[PDB]
């Protein structure tokens, strides 16, 4: 399979890594990424609990909401971290860490 990461709209910030590996993107998670992750997961668990009370399955509903929130929050944090490493999002921290290591 031939691949090509090249985007239609070029990056407006310095490109620290054109096609960062999965584990590199995850290790690039910042405090703000974890805050987004945790907030999305917590809101999802809360919605699961509250919507589960009337059917009587608040626990399992919490688990289902938490799974949805975990997947969505991880995808959002990955989106942000990868976009920063690729230069699509403001990436002052990535540039600073890159100019030193």
């Amino acid at each position: 399979m031939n691949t090509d990461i090249t985007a239609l709209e070029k990056a407006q910030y310095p490109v620290v890594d054109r096609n960062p590996a999965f584990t590199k993107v995850v290790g690039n998670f910042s405090t703000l990424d974890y805050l987004r992750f945790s907030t999305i997961t917590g809101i999802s668990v809360t919605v699961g609990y509250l919507s589960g009370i009337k059917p009587g399955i608040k626990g399992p509903s919490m688990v289902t909401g938490g799974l949805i929130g975990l997947m969505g929050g991880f995808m959002y944090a990955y989106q942000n971290s990868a976009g920063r490493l690729m230069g699509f999002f403001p990436n002052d921290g990535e540039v600073a860490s890159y100019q030193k290591r």
Partner: peptide, 29 residues
């Protein structure tokens, strides 16, 4: 003395985490 409903306690923790994480998200952005 103690709240015994474990699922309710977990939901309380989740709501608190959502609130505090939202505050931090605003503050650090």
């Amino acid at each position: 003395k103690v709240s015994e409903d474990k699922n309710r306690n977990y939901a309380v923790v989740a709501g608190v985490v959502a609130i505090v994480g939202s505050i931090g998200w605003y503050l650090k952005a």
